[PDB]
Amino acid sequence: MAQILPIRFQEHLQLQNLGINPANIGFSTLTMESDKFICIREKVGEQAQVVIIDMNDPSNPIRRPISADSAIMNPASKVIALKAGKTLQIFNIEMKSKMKAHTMTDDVTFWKWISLNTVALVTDNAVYHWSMEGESQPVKMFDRHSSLAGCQIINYRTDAKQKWLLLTGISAQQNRVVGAMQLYSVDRKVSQPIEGHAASFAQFKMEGNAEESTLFCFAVRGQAGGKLHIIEVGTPPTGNQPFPKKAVDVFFPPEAQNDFPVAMQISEKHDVVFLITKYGYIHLYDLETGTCIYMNRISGETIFVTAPHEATAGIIGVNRKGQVLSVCVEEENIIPYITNVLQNPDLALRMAVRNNLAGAEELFARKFNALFAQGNYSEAAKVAANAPKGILRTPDTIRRFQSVPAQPGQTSPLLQYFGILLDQGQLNKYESLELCRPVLQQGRKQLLEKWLKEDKLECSEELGDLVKSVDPTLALSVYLRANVPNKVIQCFA
Amino acid sequence: MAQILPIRFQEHLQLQNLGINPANIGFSTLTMESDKFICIREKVGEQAQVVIIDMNDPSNPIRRPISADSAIMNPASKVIALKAGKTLQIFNIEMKSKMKAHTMTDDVTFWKWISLNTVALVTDNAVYHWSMEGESQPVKMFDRHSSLAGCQIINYRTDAKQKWLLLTGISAQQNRVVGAMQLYSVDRKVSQPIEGHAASFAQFKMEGNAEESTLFCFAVRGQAGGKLHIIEVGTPPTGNQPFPKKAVDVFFPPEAQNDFPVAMQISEKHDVVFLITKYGYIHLYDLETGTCIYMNRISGETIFVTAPHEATAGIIGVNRKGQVLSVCVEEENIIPYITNVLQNPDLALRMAVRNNLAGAEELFARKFNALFAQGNYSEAAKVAANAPKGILRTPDTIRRFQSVPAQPGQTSPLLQYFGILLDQGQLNKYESLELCRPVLQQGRKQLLEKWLKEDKLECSEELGDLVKSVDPTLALSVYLRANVPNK
Amino acid sequence: MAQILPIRFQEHLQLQNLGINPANIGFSTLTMESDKFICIREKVGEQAQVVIIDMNDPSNPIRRPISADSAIMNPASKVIALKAGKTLQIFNIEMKSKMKAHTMTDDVTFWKWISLNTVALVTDNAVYHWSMEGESQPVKMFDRHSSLAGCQIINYRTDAKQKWLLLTGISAQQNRVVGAMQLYSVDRKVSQPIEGHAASFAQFKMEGNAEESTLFCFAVRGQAGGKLHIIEVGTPPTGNQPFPKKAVDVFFPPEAQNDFPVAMQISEKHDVVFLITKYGYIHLYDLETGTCIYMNRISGETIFVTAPHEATAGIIGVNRKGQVLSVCVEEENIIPYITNVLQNPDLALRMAVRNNLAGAEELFARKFNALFAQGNYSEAAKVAANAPKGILRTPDTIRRFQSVPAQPGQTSPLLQYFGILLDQGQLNKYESLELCRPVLQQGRKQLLEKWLKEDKLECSEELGDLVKSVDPTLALSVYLRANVPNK
């Protein structure tokens, strides 16, 4: 079967161990706006309170009597947004002060922090955005599209720049839980309906572009089965190649009778899409190609709320038992898993270099060595310059390139390689020495002077000693940047 | 593949994020005597120090300049045992006082806390046990058997009662790593050699016995390949059926060229044996039958040290990258995984009831009605009394039992049932209302009292208003145990 | 003047910033039993309290209403000893419980923790020692000698082993303060009077002995003037050369009219005696020779209480303004200061090697090079094995020894050097390789096996590759020790 675990499945806390009534671990009584806090609304006895679990010391909840139709914590600060029917309030739990309130005209039918300081109020007819800053009041962003009329609103998301907003609701239409999404463009004041169950946006800088694309990923299970779509949203930064829209199907086994997507979070650190189904299944898809990397079942109960897990760049959620679960890529097993279990070494090397992950060292040496025969020193050096965890940025790799003669005409494979590196970035101690040694003989001061200024060489006492052999004056410069001891400077006395 | 994940796989820490030199993340510089601390010996600069990581706030190591050939922390307290060549020292990190020392005559060649307050010193010729308590000195327990001569000593274990001790060493044979264990009996002052790679002891109260057996499980990749053995050690408590020794083979895939067992820990909470191989593989075996439940690979690098993970009843270890990993049973997925992925409900139900594992309310709330719809109503009671999470401990059940076949000479199964629970512990509010009621219905305080003195009963206001018609002061107790208002 | 500053001078806390009445910053109201707490007795309003400053978070005193003629905290734990006239009490501030009390028969005229759990009660006639442990009661240790009759008792000290006890008092005799000390021998139940102002004991292992001497250092400014004396106390451990008693004068400038010693603390980490005078002056003396290293004035007000500063191995005290000051050796400046400012390079190299301090690297190479040139290869290797911070423990040194042509019968200067190292401790990766290579080429693991068991070699993948040949299991363990990837 599969033979290396590509993800980690962790259980950060078990809510009942905090003595939380399991009647209160649900959609309407439990919220998770970020991986920072969990907030439960409980009626202890005849009294109503709010239990706030700070995931950074979950062992110690914060309880407050607080009657509220709903409560949702800030994604990052001890600021809570309580809703009493139509009177919204934004209180500072931290210093018990009341930051700001507002009686809506109609009842907020779903709401949710969309950022460090803006709440999103979904009315029966419109979505607003309320900043927890100042005297400001709620600001309508758009009007609910009609495809979502009478829908149970389950989520609202935004792209990083809050220029594209997505609203989702589900219906039990004719014996299936059908999902309805409304994707509204802020800048182009337009709005369109998509059948979708779960989605998320992502910033993704394509190979060869200088700007991140803004992607919108969404999944659904329709008559034609479940599918996952990854499409760029809006107009590519000027000068960017566009991102080819993608579409992949998301499998459901027969046992997974009427399962359907329920949550999605994307790892910007690994460019992997995490999808959770109604019945507790989890899938990982490659964000750039939509390739399915892994599927399994982690929960039998439903994970009714989730959020990205910043520590691991994964996904964390809570299910009906009270388990606060999380899943993430095991950075040390995924490349090997794609190569050996997926038997997809091409996805593996891409994902590896793209994300600087390890496990494809043998494929990289292989690839370098291969290009070296063909004598494509230039392609060969691209590979050593970009392969992860500096696996080919070695002295031996310089000795390799140093060994092939400069036929009359073009540029040396070594100088070529050092070219790539100098572009790529900053060179080490060994590389700077090997780069400078010759040049220094060739009386080329100016050149090392620019490499220095443009800060491309990792100065060293040794690179300095070398230069002192040609420019004792140019030395001080490297030394003064090299972190040497006075003796080295006092010699210049 | 898996229609389900029966285990959790976690990372509790990433040592280099604590800026720990990865040259120091090894067998000889890193030790984990329990899941409570991790202790690294580092030479920062030209200076030597000890970094102590308290797993209960790993974010903040404790560093101290401390030259020591070796350092191992207490399994539970901030007491550290340092070794300078031949001079052992037991210092109190907590309040920086020196608790106790002792120059050994020969060099301790391996050592390790075997309990909250005893260190085990392994000499080239003998194993001693040193208590960190008092003026006492190291006390030889046995002499190294000869099969272990010239072996790299890799571990020393004990049974809970420290009546059985196990010493392990490995040797680079020709081109194989051969493990050599010495299983010494304390009470029966005898000692025997076993070829073993990894092992652990476990207390296990068999189905139908009143005492826990003491098992000794060990694994090896013999010329006969890998095998796992689970055997009882010593003489069964009196009245205990003996535990049938077991033997299962442990699989190694072809890719796992020359892998071999390296660590073992048993979950007493779930009766599952966790085995970790040299190449990063993990297996879970059923402790009572040796059945293999799960296998996978969690690490590419070697997990060179481990310990039971108390919080989860699993295993936690550290590998070469500095990852502090842990694996455990996902209590909510394992029964379903065995019944469905493993296809093995016999094991599943064994496991379920044996360990109070959820995941079988179905074929459980089934087995009952099974025997009811039969003529059997006393195995049905046992059945609806050991089913997990009180699943069938329902009134609808006692009811089913009250309307029980009233047939002469045969003990009443409602009362036979009321027996399992009685012999089990406290009866719930209701179960204790129908148990009692008739007794007092009879007008007997003699038994009511007894059960009460032993908390076998959860009182109510009912029982209150009940036991009252008989004698107050008894009811008062029952009424208080139940807690009612000033009227 | 000074080209370099040999000490650090720090302010740790301004007591008035903690809003402490400066009327209460005195001998009788402020106590400092260790650098761990400062304890002030204040009458806030009409109420009497005890302010306990935990130097590990001085920002937050602990206050308690507590009428007591006196209060002195434990040197290390939150245990306080309160004295109500004649009723001594030892309370646990931590968990507010009362640990132990005792009404003395006569009034304790001075008292003071002499250790983690013993208080010393000085009576008008006798000194006792009371352990804060158990039901035990105060235990007379001796009877005040008569030279100390009617003396203001200012201090009481002990040697580490509490076998020698010292009592000091002052009294004005006409114009000045005459210090009177009573040095009592516990073992030899004798006691003698010394004229002294301040003193302290120190454990000091002499060059060439295997046991630490117990020294007693004391200073005085009476009839011959100021002098400092360092003398061994008792009978040298068996096999120890005795410590030549020392005597140095302690200078007082003219402006320091009637100044006189007031406090002393010795750094065991640097073997430097810190002396504080009545008028705020500080002197540093070499403990072994009594050579005066440094003098200066740090306070104008009097530092009326002090204690050793563990963190820096210096001295910390409090003066009349409420400044909690401290002085210590600046480990990176002292050798250069002695060499260069004091111009005593011999003292500098000794102190440097003795106390393994940076700063004399060029003098050490020089010294090595010089002996090497002369052919004094054994002395040359002593120098490289003992020069501080591993300065000559380089491969070059090995290679310098490796240049010496052989000579039948004569043992190589290298093997000699490696001898010294192997005695002094363990060796690095290069030294272990150069030590083992030959031996190994003679397939004789019999040696390397002992060096290993001993922990004297620093393994490596290379030292391992060398061994793999000879013995496989020995390489397995050398690799295990040096710790290698799965290659």
Curated annotation (Swiss-Prot), chain A:
Q: Where are the stretches annotated WD40-like repeat 3?
A: 108-149
Region (Binding site for the uncoating ATPase, involved in lattice disassembly) residue spans: 449-465
Identify the stretch(es) annotated as WD40-like repeat 4.
150-195
Q: Could you identify this protein by its name? A: Clathrin heavy chain 1
Q: Which domain of life is it from?
A: Eukaryota
Residue numbers carrying Phosphoserine: 67
User: What does the domain comment read?
Assistant: The N-terminal seven-bladed beta-propeller is formed by WD40-like repeats, and projects inward from the polyhedral outer clathrin coat. It constitutes a major protein-protein interaction node.
**Chain's role:** Clathrin is the major protein of the polyhedral coat of coated pits and vesicles. Two different adapter protein complexes link the clathrin lattice either to the plasma membrane or to the trans-Golgi network. Acts as a component of the TACC3/ch-TOG/clathrin complex proposed to contribute to stabilization of kinetochore fibers of the mitotic spindle by acting as inter-microtubule bridge. The TACC3/ch-TOG/clathrin complex is required for the maintenance of kinetochore fiber tension. Plays a role in early autophagosome formation.
Q: Where is this region: WD40-like repeat 5?
A: 196-257
Q: Where is this region: WD40-like repeat 7?
A: 302-330
Assembly description: Clathrin triskelions, composed of 3 heavy chains and 3 light chains, are the basic subunits of the clathrin coat. In the presence of light chains, hub assembly is influenced by both the pH and the concentration of calcium. Interacts with HIP1. Interacts with DENND1A, DENND1B and DENND1C. Interacts with OCRL. Interacts with ERBB2. Interacts with FKBP6. Interacts with CKAP5 and TACC3 forming the TACC3/ch-TOG/clathrin complex located at spindle inter-microtubules bridges; the complex implicates clathrin triskelions; TACC3 and CLTC are proposed to form a composite microtubule interaction surface.
Protein family per UniProt: Belongs to the clathrin heavy chain family.
